[PDB]
């Protein structure tokens, strides 16, 4: 029972489960959009949970040519 997110240990009633290891209830949050995540609607990058989409699919997932934004990001 140890948090992949923050690197603490995870007290029981403060827990959430994903990738067969636990987390902190607050922690499990998008590091893209900053939405607190739900019972199996997230997904994990290496020491950072996220949206299942788009945020996961966008930042950690194969993409097209190379038309990334200039300075302010968008639907890339
Ligand atoms: Zn945590
Ligand atoms: Zn998100």
PDB file of N, CA, C and O and ligand atoms in Angstrom:
ATOM      1  N   UNK A   1       0.815  -1.242   0.000  1.00  0.00           N
ATOM      2  CA  UNK A   1       0.000   0.000   0.000  1.00  0.00           C
ATOM      3  C   UNK A   1       0.838   1.277   0.000  1.00  0.00           C
ATOM      4  O   UNK A   1       1.184   1.802   1.056  1.00  0.00           O
ATOM      5  N   UNK A   2       1.296   1.654  -1.189  1.00  0.00           N
ATOM      6  CA  UNK A   2       2.289   2.710  -1.333  1.00  0.00           C
ATOM      7  C   UNK A   2       2.053   3.487  -2.625  1.00  0.00           C
ATOM      8  O   UNK A   2       1.766   2.904  -3.668  1.00  0.00           O
ATOM      9  N   UNK A   3       2.119   4.809  -2.518  1.00  0.00           N
ATOM     10  CA  UNK A   3       1.575   5.683  -3.566  1.00  0.00           C
ATOM     11  C   UNK A   3       2.627   5.859  -4.672  1.00  0.00           C
ATOM     12  O   UNK A   3       3.609   6.614  -4.505  1.00  0.00           O
ATOM     13  N   UNK A   4       2.303   5.349  -5.875  1.00  0.00           N
ATOM     14  CA  UNK A   4       3.100   5.612  -7.103  1.00  0.00           C
ATOM     15  C   UNK A   4       3.190   7.094  -7.458  1.00  0.00           C
ATOM     16  O   UNK A   4       3.930   7.480  -8.361  1.00  0.00           O
ATOM     17  N   UNK A   5       2.240   7.855  -6.919  1.00  0.00           N
ATOM     18  CA  UNK A   5       2.125   9.273  -7.225  1.00  0.00           C
ATOM     19  C   UNK A   5       3.169  10.071  -6.450  1.00  0.00           C
ATOM     20  O   UNK A   5       4.090  10.639  -7.033  1.00  0.00           O
ATOM     21  N   UNK A   6       2.937  10.202  -5.146  1.00  0.00           N
ATOM     22  CA  UNK A   6       3.656  11.179  -4.335  1.00  0.00           C
ATOM     23  C   UNK A   6       4.882  10.542  -3.690  1.00  0.00           C
ATOM     24  O   UNK A   6       5.732  11.237  -3.132  1.00  0.00           O
ATOM     25  N   UNK A   7       4.844   9.218  -3.587  1.00  0.00           N
ATOM     26  CA  UNK A   7       5.836   8.468  -2.835  1.00  0.00           C
ATOM     27  C   UNK A   7       5.630   8.666  -1.331  1.00  0.00           C
ATOM     28  O   UNK A   7       6.594   8.885  -0.596  1.00  0.00           O
ATOM     29  N   UNK A   8       4.429   8.333  -0.871  1.00  0.00           N
ATOM     30  CA  UNK A   8       4.194   8.041   0.541  1.00  0.00           C
ATOM     31  C   UNK A   8       3.738   6.594   0.706  1.00  0.00           C
ATOM     32  O   UNK A   8       3.681   5.841  -0.267  1.00  0.00           O
ATOM     33  N   UNK A   9       3.271   6.271   1.908  1.00  0.00           N
ATOM     34  CA  UNK A   9       2.463   5.072   2.118  1.00  0.00           C
ATOM     35  C   UNK A   9       0.994   5.468   2.290  1.00  0.00           C
ATOM     36  O   UNK A   9       0.673   6.451   2.955  1.00  0.00           O
ATOM     37  N   UNK A  10       0.115   4.539   1.918  1.00  0.00           N
ATOM     38  CA  UNK A  10      -1.289   4.897   1.695  1.00  0.00           C
ATOM     39  C   UNK A  10      -2.158   4.252   2.768  1.00  0.00           C
ATOM     40  O   UNK A  10      -2.120   3.039   2.970  1.00  0.00           O
ATOM     41  N   UNK A  11      -2.725   5.110   3.620  1.00  0.00           N
ATOM     42  CA  UNK A  11      -3.638   4.653   4.661  1.00  0.00           C
ATOM     43  C   UNK A  11      -4.939   4.156   4.042  1.00  0.00           C
ATOM     44  O   UNK A  11      -5.380   4.644   3.002  1.00  0.00           O
ATOM     45  N   UNK A  12      -5.609   3.242   4.743  1.00  0.00           N
ATOM     46  CA  UNK A  12      -6.600   2.379   4.105  1.00  0.00           C
ATOM     47  C   UNK A  12      -7.727   3.206   3.495  1.00  0.00           C
ATOM     48  O   UNK A  12      -7.694   3.510   2.298  1.00  0.00           O
ATOM     49  N   UNK A  13      -8.429   3.928   4.380  1.00  0.00           N
ATOM     50  CA  UNK A  13      -9.627   4.654   3.943  1.00  0.00           C
ATOM     51  C   UNK A  13      -9.271   5.841   3.057  1.00  0.00           C
ATOM     52  O   UNK A  13     -10.150   6.431   2.421  1.00  0.00           O
ATOM     53  N   UNK A  14      -7.973   6.033   2.858  1.00  0.00           N
ATOM     54  CA  UNK A  14      -7.480   7.105   2.008  1.00  0.00           C
ATOM     55  C   UNK A  14      -7.049   6.554   0.648  1.00  0.00           C
ATOM     56  O   UNK A  14      -6.264   7.180  -0.061  1.00  0.00           O
ATOM     57  N   UNK A  15      -7.452   5.316   0.374  1.00  0.00           N
ATOM     58  CA  UNK A  15      -6.813   4.516  -0.661  1.00  0.00           C
ATOM     59  C   UNK A  15      -7.593   4.626  -1.974  1.00  0.00           C
ATOM     60  O   UNK A  15      -8.826   4.638  -1.962  1.00  0.00           O
ATOM     61  N   UNK A  16      -6.885   4.405  -3.078  1.00  0.00           N
ATOM     62  CA  UNK A  16      -7.510   3.978  -4.329  1.00  0.00           C
ATOM     63  C   UNK A  16      -6.574   3.028  -5.076  1.00  0.00           C
ATOM     64  O   UNK A  16      -5.399   2.915  -4.716  1.00  0.00           O
ATOM     65  N   UNK A  17      -7.179   2.144  -5.864  1.00  0.00           N
ATOM     66  CA  UNK A  17      -6.461   1.028  -6.463  1.00  0.00           C
ATOM     67  C   UNK A  17      -6.378   1.193  -7.977  1.00  0.00           C
ATOM     68  O   UNK A  17      -7.303   1.690  -8.612  1.00  0.00           O
ATOM     69  N   UNK A  18      -5.190   0.916  -8.508  1.00  0.00           N
ATOM     70  CA  UNK A  18      -4.951   1.009  -9.941  1.00  0.00           C
ATOM     71  C   UNK A  18      -3.543   0.513 -10.275  1.00  0.00           C
ATOM     72  O   UNK A  18      -2.628   0.657  -9.462  1.00  0.00           O
ATOM     73  N   UNK A  19      -3.482  -0.353 -11.284  1.00  0.00           N
ATOM     74  CA  UNK A  19      -2.264  -1.074 -11.615  1.00  0.00           C
ATOM     75  C   UNK A  19      -1.811  -1.931 -10.434  1.00  0.00           C
ATOM     76  O   UNK A  19      -0.629  -2.245 -10.304  1.00  0.00           O
ATOM     77  N   UNK A  20      -2.790  -2.452  -9.702  1.00  0.00           N
ATOM     78  CA  UNK A  20      -2.543  -3.471  -8.692  1.00  0.00           C
ATOM     79  C   UNK A  20      -1.631  -2.928  -7.597  1.00  0.00           C
ATOM     80  O   UNK A  20      -1.146  -3.680  -6.752  1.00  0.00           O
ATOM     81  N   UNK A  21      -1.538  -1.604  -7.531  1.00  0.00           N
ATOM     82  CA  UNK A  21      -0.982  -0.926  -6.363  1.00  0.00           C
ATOM     83  C   UNK A  21      -1.825   0.298  -6.016  1.00  0.00           C
ATOM     84  O   UNK A  21      -2.626   0.755  -6.832  1.00  0.00           O
ATOM     85  N   UNK A  22      -1.785   0.676  -4.742  1.00  0.00           N
ATOM     86  CA  UNK A  22      -2.745   1.624  -4.190  1.00  0.00           C
ATOM     87  C   UNK A  22      -2.249   3.055  -4.379  1.00  0.00           C
ATOM     88  O   UNK A  22      -1.059   3.286  -4.588  1.00  0.00           O
ATOM     89  N   UNK A  23      -3.102   3.991  -3.958  1.00  0.00           N
ATOM     90  CA  UNK A  23      -2.802   5.413  -4.122  1.00  0.00           C
ATOM     91  C   UNK A  23      -3.442   6.196  -2.970  1.00  0.00           C
ATOM     92  O   UNK A  23      -4.354   5.678  -2.316  1.00  0.00           O
ATOM     93  N   UNK A  24      -3.279   7.516  -3.052  1.00  0.00           N
ATOM     94  CA  UNK A  24      -4.001   8.436  -2.185  1.00  0.00           C
ATOM     95  C   UNK A  24      -5.203   9.027  -2.915  1.00  0.00           C
ATOM     96  O   UNK A  24      -5.186   9.182  -4.135  1.00  0.00           O
ATOM     97  N   UNK A  25      -6.290   9.217  -2.173  1.00  0.00           N
ATOM     98  CA  UNK A  25      -7.587   9.509  -2.761  1.00  0.00           C
ATOM     99  C   UNK A  25      -7.513  10.823  -3.566  1.00  0.00           C
ATOM    100  O   UNK A  25      -7.846  10.870  -4.760  1.00  0.00           O
ATOM    101  N   UNK A  26      -6.874  11.835  -2.944  1.00  0.00           N
ATOM    102  CA  UNK A  26      -6.604  13.136  -3.603  1.00  0.00           C
ATOM    103  C   UNK A  26      -5.664  13.033  -4.802  1.00  0.00           C
ATOM    104  O   UNK A  26      -5.732  13.845  -5.724  1.00  0.00           O
ATOM    105  N   UNK A  27      -4.685  12.143  -4.683  1.00  0.00           N
ATOM    106  CA  UNK A  27      -3.534  12.139  -5.579  1.00  0.00           C
ATOM    107  C   UNK A  27      -3.981  11.850  -7.015  1.00  0.00           C
ATOM    108  O   UNK A  27      -3.368  12.344  -7.963  1.00  0.00           O
ATOM    109  N   UNK A  28      -4.822  10.831  -7.146  1.00  0.00           N
ATOM    110  CA  UNK A  28      -5.121  10.230  -8.439  1.00  0.00           C
ATOM    111  C   UNK A  28      -5.788  11.250  -9.356  1.00  0.00           C
ATOM    112  O   UNK A  28      -7.011  11.394  -9.351  1.00  0.00           O
ATOM    113  N   UNK A  29      -4.960  12.067  -9.999  1.00  0.00           N
ATOM    114  CA  UNK A  29      -5.431  13.268 -10.675  1.00  0.00           C
ATOM    115  C   UNK A  29      -4.662  13.484 -11.975  1.00  0.00           C
ATOM    116  O   UNK A  29      -3.452  13.273 -12.034  1.00  0.00           O
ATOM    117  N   UNK A  30      -5.343  14.094 -12.939  1.00  0.00           N
ATOM    118  CA  UNK A  30      -4.734  14.461 -14.204  1.00  0.00           C
ATOM    119  C   UNK A  30      -3.656  15.529 -13.990  1.00  0.00           C
ATOM    120  O   UNK A  30      -3.999  16.699 -13.769  1.00  0.00           O
ATOM    121  N   UNK A  31      -2.472  15.227 -14.524  1.00  0.00           N
ATOM    122  CA  UNK A  31      -1.386  16.195 -14.589  1.00  0.00           C
ATOM    123  C   UNK A  31      -1.372  16.880 -15.956  1.00  0.00           C
ATOM    124  O   UNK A  31      -0.420  17.586 -16.289  1.00  0.00           O
ATOM    125  N   UNK A  32      -2.526  16.855 -16.611  1.00  0.00           N
ATOM    126  CA  UNK A  32      -2.755  17.648 -17.810  1.00  0.00           C
ATOM    127  C   UNK A  32      -3.812  18.715 -17.545  1.00  0.00           C
ATOM    128  O   UNK A  32      -3.506  19.905 -17.490  1.00  0.00           O
ATOM    129  N   UNK A  33      -5.003  18.254 -17.155  1.00  0.00           N
ATOM    130  CA  UNK A  33      -6.155  19.147 -17.073  1.00  0.00           C
ATOM    131  C   UNK A  33      -6.472  19.489 -15.628  1.00  0.00           C
ATOM    132  O   UNK A  33      -7.235  20.413 -15.345  1.00  0.00           O
ATOM    133  N   UNK A  34      -5.979  18.652 -14.719  1.00  0.00           N
ATOM    134  CA  UNK A  34      -6.128  18.893 -13.290  1.00  0.00           C
ATOM    135  C   UNK A  34      -7.542  18.543 -12.837  1.00  0.00           C
ATOM    136  O   UNK A  34      -8.072  19.145 -11.906  1.00  0.00           O
ATOM    137  N   UNK A  35      -8.085  17.481 -13.425  1.00  0.00           N
ATOM    138  CA  UNK A  35      -9.309  16.868 -12.928  1.00  0.00           C
ATOM    139  C   UNK A  35      -8.980  15.685 -12.023  1.00  0.00           C
ATOM    140  O   UNK A  35      -8.322  14.736 -12.441  1.00  0.00           O
ATOM    141  N   UNK A  36      -9.567  15.701 -10.828  1.00  0.00           N
ATOM    142  CA  UNK A  36      -9.542  14.545  -9.944  1.00  0.00           C
ATOM    143  C   UNK A  36     -10.231  13.354 -10.608  1.00  0.00           C
ATOM    144  O   UNK A  36     -11.187  13.526 -11.365  1.00  0.00           O
ATOM    145  N   UNK A  37      -9.601  12.191 -10.482  1.00  0.00           N
ATOM    146  CA  UNK A  37      -9.935  11.037 -11.308  1.00  0.00           C
ATOM    147  C   UNK A  37     -10.870  10.096 -10.554  1.00  0.00           C
ATOM    148  O   UNK A  37     -11.193  10.333  -9.390  1.00  0.00           O
ATOM    149  N   UNK A  38     -11.449   9.154 -11.291  1.00  0.00           N
ATOM    150  CA  UNK A  38     -12.607   8.404 -10.817  1.00  0.00           C
ATOM    151  C   UNK A  38     -12.330   6.906 -10.888  1.00  0.00           C
ATOM    152  O   UNK A  38     -11.395   6.465 -11.554  1.00  0.00           O
ATOM    153  N   UNK A  39     -13.276   6.132 -10.357  1.00  0.00           N
ATOM    154  CA  UNK A  39     -13.144   4.682 -10.318  1.00  0.00           C
ATOM    155  C   UNK A  39     -13.042   4.118 -11.732  1.00  0.00           C
ATOM    156  O   UNK A  39     -14.034   3.684 -12.312  1.00  0.00           O
ATOM    157  N   UNK A  40     -11.805   3.982 -12.198  1.00  0.00           N
ATOM    158  CA  UNK A  40     -11.531   3.404 -13.502  1.00  0.00           C
ATOM    159  C   UNK A  40     -12.019   4.335 -14.613  1.00  0.00           C
ATOM    160  O   UNK A  40     -12.598   3.878 -15.598  1.00  0.00           O
ATOM    161  N   UNK A  41     -11.501   5.562 -14.580  1.00  0.00           N
ATOM    162  CA  UNK A  41     -11.612   6.483 -15.696  1.00  0.00           C
ATOM    163  C   UNK A  41     -10.310   7.235 -15.937  1.00  0.00           C
ATOM    164  O   UNK A  41     -10.211   8.031 -16.877  1.00  0.00           O
ATOM    165  N   UNK A  42      -9.251   6.743 -15.288  1.00  0.00           N
ATOM    166  CA  UNK A  42      -7.934   7.356 -15.422  1.00  0.00           C
ATOM    167  C   UNK A  42      -6.991   6.437 -16.193  1.00  0.00           C
ATOM    168  O   UNK A  42      -7.380   5.351 -16.620  1.00  0.00           O
ATOM    169  N   UNK A  43      -5.709   6.795 -16.173  1.00  0.00           N
ATOM    170  CA  UNK A  43      -4.645   5.888 -16.583  1.00  0.00           C
ATOM    171  C   UNK A  43      -3.284   6.499 -16.239  1.00  0.00           C
ATOM    172  O   UNK A  43      -3.203   7.671 -15.874  1.00  0.00           O
ATOM    173  N   UNK A  44      -2.279   5.635 -16.140  1.00  0.00           N
ATOM    174  CA  UNK A  44      -1.048   5.964 -15.426  1.00  0.00           C
ATOM    175  C   UNK A  44       0.105   6.123 -16.417  1.00  0.00           C
ATOM    176  O   UNK A  44       0.495   5.163 -17.081  1.00  0.00           O
ATOM    177  N   UNK A  45       0.759   7.280 -16.355  1.00  0.00           N
ATOM    178  CA  UNK A  45       2.126   7.413 -16.875  1.00  0.00           C
ATOM    179  C   UNK A  45       3.113   7.327 -15.713  1.00  0.00           C
ATOM    180  O   UNK A  45       2.708   7.319 -14.549  1.00  0.00           O
ATOM    181  N   UNK A  46       4.378   7.081 -16.043  1.00  0.00           N
ATOM    182  CA  UNK A  46       5.341   6.566 -15.070  1.00  0.00           C
ATOM    183  C   UNK A  46       5.492   7.545 -13.906  1.00  0.00           C
ATOM    184  O   UNK A  46       6.096   8.606 -14.056  1.00  0.00           O
ATOM    185  N   UNK A  47       4.692   7.303 -12.870  1.00  0.00           N
ATOM    186  CA  UNK A  47       4.630   8.192 -11.721  1.00  0.00           C
ATOM    187  C   UNK A  47       3.833   9.449 -12.059  1.00  0.00           C
ATOM    188  O   UNK A  47       4.139  10.537 -11.570  1.00  0.00           O
ATOM    189  N   UNK A  48       2.685   9.236 -12.695  1.00  0.00           N
ATOM    190  CA  UNK A  48       1.704  10.287 -12.901  1.00  0.00           C
ATOM    191  C   UNK A  48       0.465   9.716 -13.622  1.00  0.00           C
ATOM    192  O   UNK A  48       0.448   9.549 -14.851  1.00  0.00           O
ATOM    193  N   UNK A  49      -0.619   9.533 -12.841  1.00  0.00           N
ATOM    194  CA  UNK A  49      -1.968   9.256 -13.397  1.00  0.00           C
ATOM    195  C   UNK A  49      -2.510  10.377 -14.277  1.00  0.00           C
ATOM    196  O   UNK A  49      -2.017  11.505 -14.242  1.00  0.00           O
ATOM    197  N   UNK A  50      -3.645  10.102 -14.917  1.00  0.00           N
ATOM    198  CA  UNK A  50      -4.176  11.000 -15.934  1.00  0.00           C
ATOM    199  C   UNK A  50      -5.606  10.587 -16.305  1.00  0.00           C
ATOM    200  O   UNK A  50      -5.981   9.429 -16.112  1.00  0.00           O
ATOM    201  N   UNK A  51      -6.194  11.390 -17.199  1.00  0.00           N
ATOM    202  CA  UNK A  51      -7.336  10.979 -17.993  1.00  0.00           C
ATOM    203  C   UNK A  51      -6.982   9.727 -18.819  1.00  0.00           C
ATOM    204  O   UNK A  51      -6.087   9.813 -19.671  1.00  0.00           O
ATOM    205  N   UNK A  52      -7.960   8.830 -18.899  1.00  0.00           N
ATOM    206  CA  UNK A  52      -7.956   7.761 -19.887  1.00  0.00           C
ATOM    207  C   UNK A  52      -7.956   8.348 -21.300  1.00  0.00           C
ATOM    208  O   UNK A  52      -7.107   7.995 -22.120  1.00  0.00           O
ATOM    209  N   UNK A  53      -8.715   9.427 -21.462  1.00  0.00           N
ATOM    210  CA  UNK A  53      -8.605  10.290 -22.626  1.00  0.00           C
ATOM    211  C   UNK A  53      -9.061  11.720 -22.249  1.00  0.00           C
ATOM    212  O   UNK A  53      -9.882  11.917 -21.339  1.00  0.00           O
ATOM    213  N   UNK A  54      -8.862  12.634 -23.232  1.00  0.00           N
ATOM    214  CA  UNK A  54      -7.829  12.422 -24.289  1.00  0.00           C
ATOM    215  C   UNK A  54      -6.409  12.355 -23.717  1.00  0.00           C
ATOM    216  O   UNK A  54      -5.456  12.102 -24.457  1.00  0.00           O
ATOM    217  N   UNK A  55      -6.255  12.864 -22.497  1.00  0.00           N
ATOM    218  CA  UNK A  55      -4.967  13.370 -22.022  1.00  0.00           C
ATOM    219  C   UNK A  55      -3.894  12.294 -22.096  1.00  0.00           C
ATOM    220  O   UNK A  55      -2.769  12.549 -22.524  1.00  0.00           O
ATOM    221  N   UNK A  56      -4.270  11.080 -21.711  1.00  0.00           N
ATOM    222  CA  UNK A  56      -3.402   9.921 -21.851  1.00  0.00           C
ATOM    223  C   UNK A  56      -3.063   9.686 -23.320  1.00  0.00           C
ATOM    224  O   UNK A  56      -1.910   9.451 -23.674  1.00  0.00           O
ATOM    225  N   UNK A  57      -4.096   9.707 -24.154  1.00  0.00           N
ATOM    226  CA  UNK A  57      -3.970   9.292 -25.545  1.00  0.00           C
ATOM    227  C   UNK A  57      -3.185  10.328 -26.341  1.00  0.00           C
ATOM    228  O   UNK A  57      -2.744  10.067 -27.457  1.00  0.00           O
ATOM    229  N   UNK A  58      -3.096  11.529 -25.779  1.00  0.00           N
ATOM    230  CA  UNK A  58      -2.549  12.674 -26.495  1.00  0.00           C
ATOM    231  C   UNK A  58      -1.053  12.805 -26.218  1.00  0.00           C
ATOM    232  O   UNK A  58      -0.276  13.128 -27.115  1.00  0.00           O
ATOM    233  N   UNK A  59      -0.700  12.713 -24.941  1.00  0.00           N
ATOM    234  CA  UNK A  59       0.644  13.040 -24.486  1.00  0.00           C
ATOM    235  C   UNK A  59       1.512  11.787 -24.445  1.00  0.00           C
ATOM    236  O   UNK A  59       2.733  11.862 -24.570  1.00  0.00           O
ATOM    237  N   UNK A  60       0.888  10.680 -24.052  1.00  0.00           N
ATOM    238  CA  UNK A  60       1.568   9.393 -24.013  1.00  0.00           C
ATOM    239  C   UNK A  60       0.877   8.400 -24.942  1.00  0.00           C
ATOM    240  O   UNK A  60      -0.054   7.703 -24.538  1.00  0.00           O
ATOM    241  N   UNK A  61       1.204   8.504 -26.227  1.00  0.00           N
ATOM    242  CA  UNK A  61       0.533   7.740 -27.263  1.00  0.00           C
ATOM    243  C   UNK A  61       0.924   8.283 -28.652  1.00  0.00           C
ATOM    244  O   UNK A  61       1.170   9.486 -28.831  1.00  0.00           O
ATOM    245  N   UNK A  62       1.059   7.350 -29.615  1.00  0.00           N
ATOM    246  CA  UNK A  62       1.568   7.673 -30.971  1.00  0.00           C
ATOM    247  C   UNK A  62       0.740   8.730 -31.698  1.00  0.00           C
ATOM    248  O   UNK A  62      -0.449   8.893 -31.425  1.00  0.00           O
ATOM    249  N   UNK A  63       1.427   9.546 -32.489  1.00  0.00           N
ATOM    250  CA  UNK A  63       0.830  10.735 -33.079  1.00  0.00           C
ATOM    251  C   UNK A  63       1.184  10.828 -34.560  1.00  0.00           C
ATOM    252  O   UNK A  63       1.692   9.874 -35.147  1.00  0.00           O
ATOM    253  N   UNK A  64       0.768  11.928 -35.177  1.00  0.00           N
ATOM    254  CA  UNK A  64       0.832  12.073 -36.624  1.00  0.00           C
ATOM    255  C   UNK A  64       2.171  12.677 -37.041  1.00  0.00           C
ATOM    256  O   UNK A  64       3.229  12.140 -36.722  1.00  0.00           O
ATOM    257  N   UNK A  65       2.094  13.715 -37.867  1.00  0.00           N
ATOM    258  CA  UNK A  65       3.272  14.262 -38.526  1.00  0.00           C
ATOM    259  C   UNK A  65       4.209  14.895 -37.502  1.00  0.00           C
ATOM    260  O   UNK A  65       5.292  14.378 -37.236  1.00  0.00           O
ATOM    261  N   UNK A  66       3.839  16.090 -37.055  1.00  0.00           N
ATOM    262  CA  UNK A  66       4.720  16.915 -36.240  1.00  0.00           C
ATOM    263  C   UNK A  66       4.212  18.354 -36.196  1.00  0.00           C
ATOM    264  O   UNK A  66       4.957  19.294 -36.463  1.00  0.00           O
ATOM    265  N   UNK A  67       2.906  18.491 -35.994  1.00  0.00           N
ATOM    266  CA  UNK A  67       2.233  19.775 -36.134  1.00  0.00           C
ATOM    267  C   UNK A  67       1.921  20.363 -34.763  1.00  0.00           C
ATOM    268  O   UNK A  67       1.034  21.205 -34.626  1.00  0.00           O
ATOM    269  N   UNK A  68       2.805  20.077 -33.811  1.00  0.00           N
ATOM    270  CA  UNK A  68       2.631  20.540 -32.442  1.00  0.00           C
ATOM    271  C   UNK A  68       2.620  22.064 -32.394  1.00  0.00           C
ATOM    272  O   UNK A  68       3.068  22.728 -33.327  1.00  0.00           O
ATOM    273  N   UNK A  69       1.970  22.596 -31.363  1.00  0.00           N
ATOM    274  CA  UNK A  69       1.689  24.022 -31.280  1.00  0.00           C
ATOM    275  C   UNK A  69       2.987  24.818 -31.186  1.00  0.00           C
ATOM    276  O   UNK A  69       4.077  24.256 -31.281  1.00  0.00           O
ATOM    277  N   UNK A  70       2.845  26.136 -31.129  1.00  0.00           N
ATOM    278  CA  UNK A  70       3.982  27.040 -31.254  1.00  0.00           C
ATOM    279  C   UNK A  70       4.472  27.467 -29.874  1.00  0.00           C
ATOM    280  O   UNK A  70       5.648  27.771 -29.689  1.00  0.00           O
ATOM    281  N   UNK A  71       3.524  27.621 -28.956  1.00  0.00           N
ATOM    282  CA  UNK A  71       3.793  28.248 -27.667  1.00  0.00           C
ATOM    283  C   UNK A  71       2.644  27.970 -26.697  1.00  0.00           C
ATOM    284  O   UNK A  71       2.847  27.369 -25.644  1.00  0.00           O
ATOM    285  N   UNK A  72       1.430  28.227 -27.172  1.00  0.00           N
ATOM    286  CA  UNK A  72       0.224  27.809 -26.473  1.00  0.00           C
ATOM    287  C   UNK A  72      -0.352  26.548 -27.115  1.00  0.00           C
ATOM    288  O   UNK A  72      -0.513  26.478 -28.331  1.00  0.00           O
ATOM    289  N   UNK A  73      -0.511  25.515 -26.294  1.00  0.00           N
ATOM    290  CA  UNK A  73      -0.843  24.185 -26.783  1.00  0.00           C
ATOM    291  C   UNK A  73      -2.274  24.155 -27.313  1.00  0.00           C
ATOM    292  O   UNK A  73      -3.086  25.017 -26.981  1.00  0.00           O
ATOM    293  N   UNK A  74      -2.599  23.075 -28.014  1.00  0.00           N
ATOM    294  CA  UNK A  74      -3.972  22.794 -28.407  1.00  0.00           C
ATOM    295  C   UNK A  74      -4.114  21.340 -28.846  1.00  0.00           C
ATOM    296  O   UNK A  74      -3.288  20.495 -28.504  1.00  0.00           O
ATOM    297  N   UNK A  75      -5.242  21.045 -29.485  1.00  0.00           N
ATOM    298  CA  UNK A  75      -5.625  19.671 -29.778  1.00  0.00           C
ATOM    299  C   UNK A  75      -4.674  19.063 -30.805  1.00  0.00           C
ATOM    300  O   UNK A  75      -4.887  19.186 -32.010  1.00  0.00           O
ATOM    301  N   UNK A  76      -3.557  18.542 -30.309  1.00  0.00           N
ATOM    302  CA  UNK A  76      -2.457  18.118 -31.163  1.00  0.00           C
ATOM    303  C   UNK A  76      -2.362  16.596 -31.188  1.00  0.00           C
ATOM    304  O   UNK A  76      -1.958  16.025 -32.212  1.00  0.00           O
TER     305      UNK A  76
HETATM  306 ZN1  LIG B   1      -0.111  10.118  -2.966  1.00  0.00          ZN
HETATM  307 ZN1  LIG B   2      -7.088  15.295 -18.274  1.00  0.00          ZN
END
